[PDB]
């Protein structure tokens, strides 16, 4: 037989800017027979892009600095034997991007993105500053998936989270919804005798809430008539010298950023 084939070429998948190597081991039994490499119609010749070499039965086509535009079929003819093989080139890139996530405080945050090359080393950033995997924050790479985990999220974790490989970034925002403020003890109706003082009292679920008190639609301010006291979660309004004009519906609105606000209503009566 004119030739004796031992291995043939195989498909090549390489990362962009790397070399690809197609090699065939073939014993040529008659000197006039030569192996030739082709890309489509062109017989390839040694150049800055293509290195062609021979070692005994081993013939090598090296494609230098592979680009996505180099992808396609590479083939050879060696007497009666012909063979073709495919070059695939992968550009490193973020295949699916970081997305915004919104969570309730206390939840576990999981943010993931997917790179085109598995097992690469990446760095995470919070608000532009590099993130170290400490304590509550953990970062991992699982094949192509890059994942940031933050346990027991609090409002202070809200911000920009970025994953970076070399100069390729993907980024998104983590937003945290704080537990809303509530009244743990609503104001309740009060009865006093005329000219006595009357003290409404309430309690909210968090300290240092800002309270505003009302009679009907009217905001009340500190005076000889209305005294206000706030102590941790408790809030009080005392109405001095209660007379019939002081009777009716009163309300309090408690506010604590970023936990919204809450409202409680009660009525004041004379005996």
For residue 124, CA distances in Å to 101, 133, 160, 165, 271 come to: 16, 9, 10, 9, 67
* SS3 assignment, position 207: coil
Residues 145 and 168 in one domain: yes
Contact call for residues 187 and 266 (beta carbons, < 8 A):
yes
Assess whether 170 and 245 both reside in one domain: no
Cα→Cα distances 246→60, 114, 218, 221, Å: 100, 66, 12, 15
Partners of 3 in the β-ladder: 28
Domain shared by 144 and 195, yes or no: no
Kindly compute the dihedral angle of the four CA atoms of residues 147, 153, 154, 160, in this order, to the nearest 10 degrees. Answer: 10
In the 8-state DSSP scheme, what is residue 69? G
Residues 86 and 144 grouped into a single domain: no
> Edge-to-edge strand order for the sheet containing 137-142?
94-96, 109-115, 145-150, 137-142
Q: Do 73 and 102 share a structural domain?
A: no
Q: Clarify whether residues 84 and 98 are in a common domain.
A: no
For residue 214, give every residue at least 6 positions away whose Cβ sits within 8 Å of its Cβ, in sequence order, or none.
220, 250, 251, 252, 253
* Whether residue 123 sits in one domain with residue 84: no
Rounded CA separation 168/123 (Å): 11
Are 171 and 192 within one domain?
no
Distance of alpha carbon 84 from alpha carbon 75, whole angstroms = 4
Checking DSSP bridges between strand 35-39 and strand 42-43, what pairing results, if any?
antiparallel
Same domain, 219 and 261: yes
Phi, psi of 25 (to 5 degrees): -100, 120
> Beta partners for 249?
267
Alpha helix (H) ranges present in 81-141?
none
Last residue of a domain, one of 90, 123, 156: 90
Q: How many domains does the chain have?
A: 3
* Rounded CA separation 167/54 (Å): 39
Deposited resolution, Å:
2.0
Residues 13 and 86 in one domain: yes
Last-in-domain residue among 147, 177, 207 = 177
CATH label of the domain that carries residue 225: 2.60.40.10
Domain shared by 257 and 193, yes or no: yes
The tokens for 34 are 């030569």
Tokens of 234: 């408790």
Are 197 and 258 within one domain?
yes
Residue with tokens 């950023």: 257
Question: With contact defined as beta carbons under 8 Å apart, do 140 and 113 qualify?
Answer: no
* Domain stop point among 90, 108, 136: 90
The boundaries of the domain holding residue 228 are 183-270
Is-contact 173 109, C-beta < 8 A? no
């Amino acid at each position: 037989m004119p030739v004796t084939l031992i291995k043939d070429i195989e498909n090549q998948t390489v990362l962009k800017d790397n070399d690809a190597v197609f090699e065939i081991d073939i014993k040529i039994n008659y000197p006039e027979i030569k192996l030739s490499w082709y890309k489509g119609t062109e017989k390839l010749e040694p150049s800055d892009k293509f290195e062609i070499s021979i070692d005994g039965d081993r013939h090598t086509l090296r494609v230098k600095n592979c680009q996505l535009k180099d992808q396609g079929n590479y083939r050879l003819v060696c007497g009666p034997h012909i063979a073709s093989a495919k070059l695939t080139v992968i550009e490193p890139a973020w295949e699916r991007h970081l997305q915004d996530v919104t969570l309730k405080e206390g939840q576990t945050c999981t943010m993931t993105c997917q790179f085109s090359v598995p097992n690469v080393k990446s760095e995470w950033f919070r608000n532009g500053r590099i993130l170290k995997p400490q304590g509550r924050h953990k970062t991992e790479v699982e094949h192509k998936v890059h994942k940031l985990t933050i346990a027991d999220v609090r409002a202070e974790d809200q911000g920009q989270y970025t994953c970076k490989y070399e100069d390729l970034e993907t980024s998104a925002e983590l937003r945290i919804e704080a537990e809303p403020i509530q009244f743990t003890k609503r104001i309740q109706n009060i009865v006093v005798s005329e000219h006595q003082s009357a003290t409404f009292e309430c309690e909210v679920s968090f300290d240092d809430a800002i309270v505003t008190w009302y009679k009907g639609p009217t905001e009340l301010t500190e005076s000889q008539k209305y005294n206000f006291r706030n102590d941790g979660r408790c809030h009080y309004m005392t109405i001095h010298n209660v007379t019939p004009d002081d009777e009716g519906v009163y309300s309090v609105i408690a506010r604590l950023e970023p936990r919204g606000e809450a409202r409680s209503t009660a009525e004041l009566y004379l005996t």
